[PDB]
Amino acid sequence: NPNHLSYFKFVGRIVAKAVYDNRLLECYFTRSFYKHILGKSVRYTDMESEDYHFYQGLVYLLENDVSTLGYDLTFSTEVQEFGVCEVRDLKVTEENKKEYVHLVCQMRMTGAIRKQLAAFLEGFYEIIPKR
Structure with a gap:
């Protein structure tokens, strides 16, 4: 959808209107998305739900020596956003x-x-102040 950001701002408005009205919605967002709406960092265990094989890669990174990787890494990763893949x-x-x-x-x-x-x-902070 070429307008999708505007629709996400609309649904954020509708969520903040339901909260302002004190009405329950049948939304079931991830713990990640609630953390994003609170401005909290995610935790690596969140990857377990979003990308199990990348969580598993990190678990191979936890409790193991970098020498188990057999090649070096740096602070850069390939990400697909909007169907474009970029190394960031x-x-x-x-x-x-x-x-x-x-x-x-x-x-x-x-x-x-x-x-x-x-x-x-x-969309959310327009109706319900972040603080």
Whole structure:
């Protein structure tokens, strides 16, 4: 849909109207999307629901030495958004991997939905103040 951001802002308006009216909707959003609507970071365990084989890659990253990978990595990942695939920087090391897994999970979760999400939040905060 070429207008999709506007429709996400509309549905965000309808969600904030239901909340303002104190009326229950049959919405069942992910914990990720509620975190996005609260401005909270996601956690790597969220990838388990969104992309199991990437969570599994991170679990091979947790509790294992980088030497198990057999090739080097850096802070960059391929993301499909709107059907375009692009390699995006996240800013690897034993200190950074704590950050690599966080930012790569951000990139993989938001990259493909970052603009839909920002439109929804624009629809939401119009009616219900963020604070």
